[PDB]
Every structure is written in structure tokens, then in C-alpha cells.
Design a protein around this ligand. Sequence first.
Ligand code: CO
Length: 258
Amino acid sequence: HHWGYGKHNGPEHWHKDFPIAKGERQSPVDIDTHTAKYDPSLKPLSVSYDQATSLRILNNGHAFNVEFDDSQDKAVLKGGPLDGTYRLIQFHFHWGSLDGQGSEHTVDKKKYAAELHLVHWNTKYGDFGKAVQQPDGLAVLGIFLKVGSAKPGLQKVVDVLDSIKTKGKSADFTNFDPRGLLPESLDYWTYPGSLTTPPLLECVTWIVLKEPISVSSEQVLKFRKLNFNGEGEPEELMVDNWRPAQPLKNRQIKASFK
Ligand SMILES: [Co+2]
């Protein structure tokens, strides 16, 4: 049946409809920091979000996506391990029922409270649906969230969530600046992997930032009041929407820093 994160349709079941789930380059993974190799051949990341145009925020039943206008090169990622230009299409988060879990990537087996994914697609493939069919189709910027001080730039997101509580609800969400979600440092780890939700396609260059951002308990608590279900269905809190770490297999994680 339809996939989700419960006991009967969670990540351990996905391989039955999506056999690539047991593939050779599945995400997320544990980042073993001692084994990642510094690659001095790696460039600095180029995040150019000055002209970003957010449009809408949507509860899609798994997460909430903040969507952007990607019909022009307004918000792009380049540099780092990437060839070419990748356009921002949406960002979303993965989070836990408790502060001790929620991220998808782990760092020396450490789990963070949440993980932000800024999803970008390679403009050489013309649109997102074509890009996910290519091994270099997507570039996803992963940022860990730890609980501590509030993230001022997150509050506009937190405050609209009660308007999209249930699956299928959307709201206008313009003039949101995703630069306010970035940590100070852009040091990163990178490896080839996959989408972390079905269809689990192996099309992603992952770029995971070393430095987490901090958010407050109140901010993450508001994530946890969302619902997986549709309006007028039994309430299932949207929590623990993370896939756990998958086998690294024949892959090397590279680090941009020493
Ligand atoms: Co994600």
C-alpha cells in the first residue's frame, strides 16, 4: 500500500513497491567524520539566493514544502562538487517526535532534531521531472537543526503552519528569504545518493553542511503539531518523517574542509 512513516508502511516496507530502496546509492547515510576524505580539489559552494521568489507552502502528507519560482535562474546553487547550475525548487524538513531524533543524515551516529533539505535541479535537463531521471539531476543542500536559541529566519515558516495543518492544504508564501536558514559556515561533506522518499531515485548529489543551525524548542514543537492526515480524518501527528541511514556501499564521502 501507499507509503508513509508508520509501523505498517514505513521505510522498511518501501522496497516492496520501490525496489531501488535496496540500491547501490541510497540516502541518507551516516557521515563517519574520521573516514570522510578532505578533497582540496573541491571548490567553495556558491549559493546565490538574492533573487529567490518563494510562492507557496504546501502540506503534502509527508512534510511541508516551501516552493519557489524555478522558471528562471533566480535561486541557484553552483560550485562545490557540482558541474553547471542547479535551480532551487523547494525546501522542506524532516523532524522527530523528540529532540533526540529527526535528522536523516547522522554524523558519527549523532542524530539531530531535524534536517532541512534545499532541493535544486540541474538546468541542463530543463525541468525537475526530467532531472530526477539522471544521476546528476539534483543537488540537495542538507542542514542540521539542533535545539537551543531560536532561528529568527525560521519564524515566518513556523507561523503559517497552522494554516496548512492537514494533507493537501497550501497557503500563499511569498517574499520568504531562504538565506535566513543558512549557518555561518558553508563547509560541507558531499557524496552521491538518492531521494530519501519514494520513488527513491538515485539522482542526488548530496551536500551536507557541517555547521548546524539552532532553532528553539517552541519552533520545533510547532512542526510537530502538523498532521499526516487529511482534514476530517483521524489525527496522526506529523512526526518522525525521516528515513534512517542506509548502507554506504561503494561510496566515499568527501569533505570540503580539514
Ligand atoms: Co528531504
